[PDB]
Design a protein around this ligand. Sequence first.
Ligand SMILES: CNC(=O)CN(CC(c1ccccc1)c1ccccc1)C(=O)c1cc(C)c(=O)n(C)c1
Length: 110
Amino acid sequence: LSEQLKHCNGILKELLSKKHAAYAWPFYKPVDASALGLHDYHDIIKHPMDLSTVKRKMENRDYRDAQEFAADVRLMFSNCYKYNPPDHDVVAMARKLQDVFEFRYAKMPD
Ligand SMILES: CNC(=O)CN(CC(c1ccccc1)c1ccccc1)C(=O)c1cc(C)c(=O)n(C)c1
């Protein structure tokens, strides 16, 4: 409800919008490790994060400030960079969506 959290909510809506769906879709929901046969995922990634979890936390007023919101969005990208080989298509899509995030996050009102 704070001005900075309104900015964060706007960014979240954009990341979930059809505008970015071509590269955002792998980040919409938690990685289903069992479904994908990624039996090492939860051994390598101790704190999973995804946009549906960020959305639930925003709706529940879990985030007290913009910094806490940004930490979860960057955790989501960091998990992807940690688990996947750097030449995987999902890493290319992470880099593109993080570019969208970082450039708009940088326009935070003071
Ligand atoms: C709706 N279903 C999905 O989102 C499937 N996916 C992505 C899916 C995939 C990527 C890697 C391994 C196994 C499937 C993939 C394949 C082709 C190109 C782009 C992504 C995931 O769950 C996934 C898996 C991992 C490890 C990850 O870091 N992220 C961010 C998402």
